[PDB]
Amino acid sequence: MAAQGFLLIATFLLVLMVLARPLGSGLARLINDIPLPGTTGVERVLFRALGVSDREMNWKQYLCAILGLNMLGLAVLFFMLLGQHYLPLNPQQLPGLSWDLALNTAVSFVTNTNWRSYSGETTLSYFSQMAGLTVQNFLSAASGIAVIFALIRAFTRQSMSTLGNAWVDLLRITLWVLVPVALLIALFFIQQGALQNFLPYQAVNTVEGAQQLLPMGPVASQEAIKMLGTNGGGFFNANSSHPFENPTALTNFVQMLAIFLIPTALCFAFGEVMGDRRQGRMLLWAMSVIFVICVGVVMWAEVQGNPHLLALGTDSSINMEGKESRFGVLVSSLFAVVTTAASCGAVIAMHDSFTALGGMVPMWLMQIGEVVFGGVGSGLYGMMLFVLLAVFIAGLMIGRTPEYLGKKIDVREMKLTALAILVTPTLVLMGAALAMMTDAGRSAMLNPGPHGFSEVLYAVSSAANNNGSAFAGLSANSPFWNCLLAFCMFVGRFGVIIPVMAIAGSLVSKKSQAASSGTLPTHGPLFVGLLIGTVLLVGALTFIPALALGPVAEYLS
């Protein structure tokens, strides 16, 4: 089993890099405002028709463009969900969402969380899932990728004042990186058993004579984009464990590869745009180390399973409870760590049922900040926040001014990165305290004991970190929970993107020094381990007391 699990991790990472470097080169071309081969002819007219005039934007204009697009996105999705009944492709005559559910869902998909407090086969219609959630999957992924595009531009450009064009970046990303890749993935899912149609719900007269109403809908399109853009927005209650959303283990493998594809490609593109592949390799090396160790811990924990199963007279202690038969325990453990490390949110195995340790590590991969192959864009600039912090403490220790890629990091940049690192954990801790202090927040706990607090903490932490995973036992359809999580998600995403764009704006203006003798090389196992320890110490010391009363307490019980 251990051998099997190691083989699975190795194959996953191997195929991941093999697919990541090509797309990394293409994304690098987009980062340098160099059109893709053969697309220049059509971009000329598309931008001419839309009004995007390749006019450079500063960090203020760029941030305002991204924010404006997301604002209009959530306004449109909010009203679409409210007026869900007055819209076409309504095979099931269901009512529009309430104000709280509409608000939470709109903020969930715009904010690239896709947190869900509903059942997508009962609640949402085909139009909301097609023109409301899928569109926001694309646009949210594109917003995150545009933010990291501008940050990488700030690192590579010399004494400039602009960060490119936000409209050009969004258009190019969503038309050539997200639409065709997701099209390829969606067609593959359809061929392996996914659902892509606009029929009404089918009636099954079961073999043994029961009535089973089968849900239909365009599931493959949303599945390709929810996995590629690390949205995690499931078409049904069961997110990626539904046989229609994830029919075979082959689709599951491709889904995990899709979750990590763009983040890895954006690291390769980061290394290639800066003119030093060692930097991208360094960044990936660190994220891969933490990822592999976490997968190993979760795998072993779930293999250890539940002692009560063996005491009650089963074959083994293997914790199948919140697992599927298609994917083994090892596959489910890997997917748990993948979806919670990449900020995807796609849960193929009910995390509430995982072992205490098994659910601890995913929780803690969200809480650290989603910096381990993190969200699409989100993960890389979170990790860049953590890199700045590491470079600071490193150059501080060696007696030289903080310098990363030759850009000196000074006071103002330090304020910005500190505030950005504080946004997420502040939300986690404050929201969890608010939930555990109100009767409406505690009543949602399905499992008693420490695991109930673990549910609350996991929910708020996933929301604040834009992951979207949830223990799924906590009932968050209440208005209090909807509003709390909506606030947490909104602040997480946008209050982290604002200071990141300020970092970019402050970094374009600076110049980059050459590689002097004393310049600390940020590439290599020394700095790799320094970055790992930075993220891990700060991550542990922030959430150890919270994790102590939740998963650790349940483990030692």
Partner: protein, 673 residues
């Protein structure tokens, strides 16, 4: 010393006011935590709250000791700085001053208080008296003793109309008299600059300091939220943890170690700087000095002793030695620079015939200028010049004269010997060359051997001949040099280096290099230097040895080293302190967590006590580390990071484990808890 420890302790007690602590947020959170825990203690002892009162009293008391030890570190540093300032202030006292009526020497002088001196006055100082104020020498030449300002009993020459005409107030003259003019006002003298460097209430935080403080604040916010939100979590899990234990956990997790020691590190840095004979107006330049990769030296006065003396006169062809020395003496009369004075002295010892009066010659004096790089006299229908090789070549070419080949050969030979060769021309015929040899100052070459070890390159900017520049370059053991460089070229070199993203540091002395000094980011202004140079240089060296920047770099590095290392230490410390508080704070809510206690402490009360006691005592145990800095060794970046992390990153993990266990065992043996 005992006096400075008791005095700093008294000052630490006096700094307990919240107004004093408002400026340091790290320790301000500790102050407020300590306040609410002593408030809880007094209230619960009175009978207004449940639970044990002596435990809260002990915890709050040790938190008060935490803030007291932080202020003790800060106060001890400031006290050790203030004492040095006291000594220098005592040296500042002057007996009296004597001002003359006319600028010429020999006029009537009257006794006037030294304090009454103002800018523009002309004061005379004879053998025995001390300099009343700073300024520049206008008449006379003598050797003054700068032991009062540098602590070295070695004498130094001071002549008028030259690069060595800068006098410092407080020195003592004993070999002859000097007439100086005080161009400084009361309160702006060089002696008061040292007080400005040492005295507090005007030493703002450095950029790096502010960035690190931002980091500590960020962490403090993190831990504040963690501990503050621990109350509702545990409250749902059962009996809520006591606010006393939460404050203990907060102050333990807060970077109180570096929080308290940060101010002390800065102050100690500036004390060590003064102790190394360097006057740095601001720590910012000292910190920037750590990132310097190219050193810009001055050949004369910085790598060489200065005041080069003439040795011999060499004729070229069809020119008697008498005519050459006579013309050189006449041309040097208008040159108040040490070069001209030495030329005249050599002519004296060689012939010593006749006397010169400007009225008897009816010719205006041509002063020496750095731009002209030549001086001379204009007698009746006669133009006589004397300057460098290129300068004399330009003039003789402008006058339709050619340079003899043997003249060039002799100049090349003298330059190969290492002496700055000067050429003198009468009308349209070159008389010959003068030998202006000089002594190297300090064990420079040996020092640069290890200067280059840490990546600092040395470039000697020189206005002499290529070969003489190359010669001293060799004796100096500098990396590269420049030949026939004017002041604008020196500045241009810094422009070139500063565009490549390389901080340039200028160790120079004369007025000629003043603007280049100012342009460079880091600088070392030699005390054997002019007031314009000093004011324009961030650091003023007193030993006047070009390798003082070595010391500077050592200090600046150390400062940043200590900062970052203590940070690594503090965060590592948090891990162990978790293992002490976590199983203890929730011993009554989740007994299962008691197995999570790995240190095997005695009791929850005692575990939290040991945590707080360690948090307090590790500031005192790091006080000497903060004052002396981190004795780092000259390594590369990756190896230096490796060493700093191996020591402090792992120390901050292992030290608290063993220390908490050691304190818990002491409490367990003493039977306190």
């Amino acid at each position: 010393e005992p006096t400075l420890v008791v005095q700093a302790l008294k000052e630490a007690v006096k700094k307990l006011n919240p107004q004093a602590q408002w400026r340091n947020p790290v320790m301000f959170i500790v102050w407020i935590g300590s306040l609410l825990t002593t408030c809880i203690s007094i209230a619960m002892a009175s009978g207004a709250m449940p639970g044990n009162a002596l435990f809260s009293a002990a915890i709050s008391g040790w938190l008060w000791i935490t803030v007291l030890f932080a202020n003790f570190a800060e106060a001890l540093a400031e006290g050790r700085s203030k004492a040095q300032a006291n000594s220098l202030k005592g040296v500042k006292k002057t007996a009296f001053a004597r001002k003359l009526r006319e600028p010429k020497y020999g006029a009537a002088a009257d006794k006037v208080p030294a304090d009454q001196l103002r800018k523009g006055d002309i004061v005379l100082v004879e053998a025995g008296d001390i300099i009343p104020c700073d300024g520049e020498v206008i008449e006379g030449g003598a050797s003054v003793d700068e032991s009062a300002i540098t602590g070295e009993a070695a004498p130094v020459i001071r002549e008028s109309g030259g690069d060595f005409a800068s006098v410092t107030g407080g020195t003592r003259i004993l070999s002859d008299w000097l007439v100086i003019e005080c161009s400084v006002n009361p309160g702006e003298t060089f002696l008061d600059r040292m007080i400005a460097m040492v005295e507090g209430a005007q030493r703002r935080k450095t950029p790096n300091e502010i960035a690190l403080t931002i980091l500590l604040i960020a962490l403090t916010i993190v831990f504040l939220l963690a501990t503050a939100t621990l109350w509702p979590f545990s409250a749902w899990g059962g009996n809520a943890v006591s606010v006393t234990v939460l404050v203990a956990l907060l102050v333990c997790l807060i970077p109180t170690t570096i929080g308290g020691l940060l101010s002390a590190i800065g102050v100690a840095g500036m004390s060590r700087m003064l102790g190394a004979n360097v006057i740095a107006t601001s720590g910012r330049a000292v910190e920037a000095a750590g990132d310097v990769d190219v050193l810009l030296l001055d050949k004369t006065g910085t790598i060489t002793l200065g005041n080069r003396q003439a040795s011999e006169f060499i004729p070229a062809q069809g020119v008697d030695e008498k005519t050459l020395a006579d013309a050189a003496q006449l041309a040097s009369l208008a040159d108040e620079t040490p070069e001209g004075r030495s030329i005249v002295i050599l002519a004296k010892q060689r012939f010593n015939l006749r006397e010169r009066d400007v009225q008897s010659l009816h010719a205006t004096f041509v002063p020496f200028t750095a731009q002209s790089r030549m001086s001379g006299i204009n007698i009746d229908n006669r133009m006589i010049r004397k300057g460098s090789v290129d300068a004399i070549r330009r003039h003789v070419e402008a006058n339709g004269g050619h340079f003899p080949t043997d003249v060039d050969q002799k100049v090349d030979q003298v330059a190969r010997q290492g002496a700055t060769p000067l050429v003198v021309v009468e009308g349209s015929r070159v008389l010959g060359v003068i030998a202006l040899k000089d002594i190297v100052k300090g064990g420079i070459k040996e020092r640069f051997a290890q200067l280059r070890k840490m990546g600092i390159k040395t470039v000697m900017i020189t206005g002499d001949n290529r070969l003489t520049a190359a010669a001293i370059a060799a004796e100096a053991g500098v990396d590269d040099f420049l030949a026939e460089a004017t002041p604008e070229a020196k500045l241009a070199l810094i422009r070139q280096y500063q565009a490549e993203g390389r901080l340039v540091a200028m160790t120079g002395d004369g007025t000629n290099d003043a603007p280049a000094l100012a342009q460079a980011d880091v600088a070392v202004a030699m005390n054997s230097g002019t007031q314009a140079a000093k004011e324009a240089g961030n650091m003023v060296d007193l030993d006047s040895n070009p390798t003082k920047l070595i010391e500077v770099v050592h200090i600046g590095k150390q400062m940043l080293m200590t900062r970052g290392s203590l940070t690594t230490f503090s965060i590592a410390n948090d891990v162990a302190k978790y293992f002490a508080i976590i199983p203890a704070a929730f011993a009554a809510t989740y007994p299962q967590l008691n197995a999570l206690n790995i240190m095997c402490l005695h009791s929850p009360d005692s575990a939290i006590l040991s945590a707080v006691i360690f948090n307090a005592l590790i500031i005192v145990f790091l006080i000497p580390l903060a004052l002396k800095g981190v004795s780092y060794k000259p390594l590369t970046a990756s190896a230096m990071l490796r060493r700093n992390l191996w020591i402090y990153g792992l120390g901050g993990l292992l030290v608290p484990f063993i220390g908490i266990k050691v304190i818990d065992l002491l409490l367990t043996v003493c039977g306190l808890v």
